[PDB]
């Protein structure tokens, strides 16, 4: 039922954790694309659409944290997966990342971001490895720096980061359906946000995330099923005032 799976597939169940708010066109293409892609690669999976329905700025990392907590307690691993980044090459390892976190959307392959420590887009971890990092920071509202920070959590935890090798498709490895004019990145740094972005967050993450699920809805998109989680993220306006206005 819950898991798309056949008896012959390897046992590891992947939760696809998709940070989401107002990307409907993209969602329509993404869900069946990922059902097809994962099924051909024989990966047991379920797709969680993590829909931010509070009115705070978009918090990718906090949503991933929520999806981690709210996914089936029998998932073995997670892929934080942008909704607009579609894998076109089946050589990409979406299998269980046993030796360490696996960064699918490598800077060698990503259309826009090419620096060594970029871990955005699509990144896979075993549940144990994600907990070892205490998940992602909750302090990043708006576009930017939540991934750079998580990189530091991975490194600090002594986890080795893996990337695809021998991929030949280069910058055509993914379809990045993202018009920068229609989908404007919320990149404004509001006051003290421009400082805290690069800080060394020592306290919080997976164990301090403040939220509640408003609704949970089964959604099927052209045959391909998923679970939409309507997520209300709390904001301590004292700690992070840059959460509001947008
Ligand atoms: O308002 C937003 C902001 C981002 N996202 C999600 O977060 C991902 C990363 O955002 P974005 O695509 O803007 O980052 P970039 O293209 O720079 O990698 C998107 O693909 C979406 O899955 C979203 O759903 N709504
Ligand atoms: Mn994008």
Swiss-Prot record:
Keywords: Disease variant, Disulfide bond, Dwarfism, Ehlers-Danlos syndrome, Glycoprotein, Glycosyltransferase, Golgi apparatus, Manganese, Membrane, Metal-binding, Signal-anchor, Transferase, Transmembrane, Transmembrane helix. GO terms for biological process: carbohydrate metabolic process; glycosaminoglycan biosynthetic process; glycosaminoglycan metabolic process; glycosylation; negative regulation of fibroblast proliferation; protein modification process; protein N-linked glycosylation; proteoglycan biosynthetic process. Mn(2+) binds at residues 84, 176. Its EC number is 2.4.1.-, 2.4.1.133. Its cofactor is Mn(2+). Glycans are attached at residue 73. GO terms for cellular component: Golgi apparatus; Golgi cisterna membrane; Golgi membrane; membrane. GO terms for molecular function: beta-N-acetylglucosaminylglycopeptide beta-1,4-galactosyltransferase activity; galactosyltransferase activity; manganese ion binding; xylosylprotein 4-beta-galactosyltransferase activity. Pathway: Protein modification; protein glycosylation. It is an enzyme of class 2 (transferase). N-acetyl-D-glucosamine binds at residues 145-148. It catalyses: 3-O-(beta-D-xylosyl)-L-seryl-[protein] + UDP-alpha-D-galactose = 3-O-(beta-D-galactosyl-(1->4)-beta-D-xylosyl)-L-seryl-[protein] + UDP + H(+). It is a single-pass type II membrane protein. High expression in heart, pancreas and liver, medium in placenta and kidney, low in brain, skeletal muscle and lung. Residues 1-246 are lumenal. UDP-alpha-D-galactose binds at residues 19-23, 58-60, 83-84, 113, 143, 176-178, 185. Disulfide bonds join 235-243. Required for the biosynthesis of the tetrasaccharide linkage region of proteoglycans, especially for small proteoglycans in skin fibroblasts. It is linked to Ehlers-Danlos syndrome, spondylodysplastic type, 1: A form of Ehlers-Danlos syndrome, a group of connective tissue disorders characterized by skin hyperextensibility, articular hypermobility, and tissue fragility. EDSSPD1 is an autosomal recessive form characterized by short stature, developmental anomalies of the forearm bones and elbow, and bowing of extremities, in addition to the classic features of Ehlers-Danlos syndrome. Belongs to the glycosyltransferase 7 family. This is Beta-1,4-galactosyltransferase 7. It comes from Homo sapiens (Human). The chain holds residues 82 to 327 of 327 of the full protein.
